[PDB]
Design a protein around this ligand. Structure first.
Ligand SMILES: C=Cc1csc(CNC(=O)c2cc[nH]n2)n1
Ligand SMILES: [Zn+2]
Ligand SMILES: [Zn+2]
Ligand SMILES: [Zn+2]
Length: 433
């Protein structure tokens, strides 16, 4: 945890707060913010913030004493008076709780406000924030993130309906990391997808994007592990199953003499009984721009497997699994320059999906293939895509009907999680019969 006696640089704040001391600790800062047990500091370290990336909410307040525009990286702008029209703080804070609860309940057990701090945002916290000792929800065992003055009760993000204060938020000022120049000039160095439209929400979006760029694009820590909040395990199991299925059938159908497996340096053979000559080539997850095939690269013999090795243009003799950054899920967070921050056990920033990368390939059709014995150890199954000896013979046996439906469920899970599959144009399932 971050010592409250650590120094906070105040130069960023001196425009909204003329005369602010240069010599400043977090202790004195919190006191100036109007605030006074498991919550040692409202501010956290970059390391703590990285561990709670899912909780990150970029936050900016803009002035014109007169009204204030509060912007958040969700896209919401609220106007408080002492896009939405001006309203007093006692109704504004109700909206802040509802918005953070709906955004974060399926993501994290807290909120981390990510700031490019110039003053108003920090002096505005006293109007919708309360702090105190760590607590638990009144209705469950999750830690409390909201408080209600109507009933003097605490709630987590799931049980906060009607609550009016944010309780024990965390926060981090990006301007402490040692930057030169304003927010827009540092953000626009790495990103063109987020504009500067002179609304507070635009600043909040840029601030979070810059943070993510610094902590996951330029710097990368794959040792950090993140809790399970979803179907992580079923998704990862489904990916290994689809990988085995698709490569096995591609070898059986086209009988490539060699396979170039390009990507993770710890990859293992996904079809260990295949006759082919299996050759590995090491590349780590690219976090910034897609690899250039010319730098990566007889790759024109046999087939190339690119299983989450994002390249700019796949060769024509490839099998490919590429993550689609546009997908909406609790695992996939907005990232930098169209990229997305996929957090499933580990945090993988991923360059933006680009359909031109697949120009030499086609989409891979669903199919189930099996050469296993028809032995069991219900509604009868009818499908043209169940490629088994039994379907060839007229009637799908029960074992293969069960496995087909399991494989379809895993296939559909992996697609819905954002993954997309692409194959060489000559792939043809008829060749497997
Ligand atoms: C209603 C009060 C109010 C205050 S400021 C504002 C509009 N926001 C900006 O001009 C701005 C500058 C940087 N980001 N946003 N509205
Ligand atoms: Zn609860
Ligand atoms: Zn950006
Ligand atoms: Zn069968």
């Amino acid at each position: 945890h971050l010592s409250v006696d650590t120094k906070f640089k105040t130069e960023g704040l001196c425009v909204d707060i003329p005369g602010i001391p240069k010599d400043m600790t977090y202790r004195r800062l919190i006191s100036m913010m109007g605030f006074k047990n498991g919550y040692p500091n409202m501010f956290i370290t970059r390391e703590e913030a990285i561990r709670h990336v899912r909780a990150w909410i970029g936050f900016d307040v803009e002035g014109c004493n007169l009204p204030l525009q509060l912007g958040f990286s969700t896209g919401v702008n609220l106007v408080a008076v002492p896009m939405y029209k001006g309203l007093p703080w006692n109704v504004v804070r109700i909206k802040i709780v509802q918005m953070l609860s709906d955004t974060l309940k399926n993501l994290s057990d807290r909120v981390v406000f990510v700031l490019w701090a110039h003053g108003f945002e920090l002096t505005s916290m006293k109007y919708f924030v309360k702090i105190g000792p760590e607590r638990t929800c009144c209705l469950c065992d999750r830690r409390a993130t909201c408080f209600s003055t109507a009933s003097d009760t605490y709630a987590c993000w799931h049980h906060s309906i009607g609550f009016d204060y944010v309780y024990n938020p965390f926060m981090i000022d990006v301007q402490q990391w040692g930057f030169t120049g304003n927010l827009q000039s540092n953000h626009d160095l790495y990103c063109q997808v987020h504009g500067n439209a002179h609304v507070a929400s635009c600043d909040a979006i840029m601030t979070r994007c810059l943070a993510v760029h610094e902590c996951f694009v330029k710097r990368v820590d794959w040792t950090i592990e993140y809790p399970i909040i979803g179907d992580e395990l079923k998704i990862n199991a489904a990916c290994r199953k689809v990988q085995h299925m698709v490569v096995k059938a591609a070898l059986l159908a086209d009988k490539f003499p060699v396979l170039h497996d390009i990507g993770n340096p710890k990859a293992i053979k996904c079809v260990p009984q295949a006759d082919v000559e299996w050759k590995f080539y090491d590349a780590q997850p690219c976090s910034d721009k897609a690899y250039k095939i010319e730098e990566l690269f007889k790759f024109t013999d046999g087939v190339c497997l690119f299983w989450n090795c994002n390249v700019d243009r796949y060769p024509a003799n490839s099998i490919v699994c590429r993550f689609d950054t546009r997908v909406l899920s609790n695992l996939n967070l907005p990232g930098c320059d169209g990229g997305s921050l996929y957090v499933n056990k580990h945090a993988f920033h991923t360059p933006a999906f680009d359909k031109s990368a697949f120009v030499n390939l086609k989409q891979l059709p669903f199919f189930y293939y099996s050469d296993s014995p028809c032995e069991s150890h219900y509604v009868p199954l009818k499908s043209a895509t169940c490629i088994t000896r039994c379907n060839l013979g007229g009637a799908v046996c029960r074992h293969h009907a069960n496995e087909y439906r399991l494989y379809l469920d895993a296939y559909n899970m992996m697609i819905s999680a954002g993954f997309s599959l692409w194959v060489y144009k000559q792939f043809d399932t008829y060749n497997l019969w």
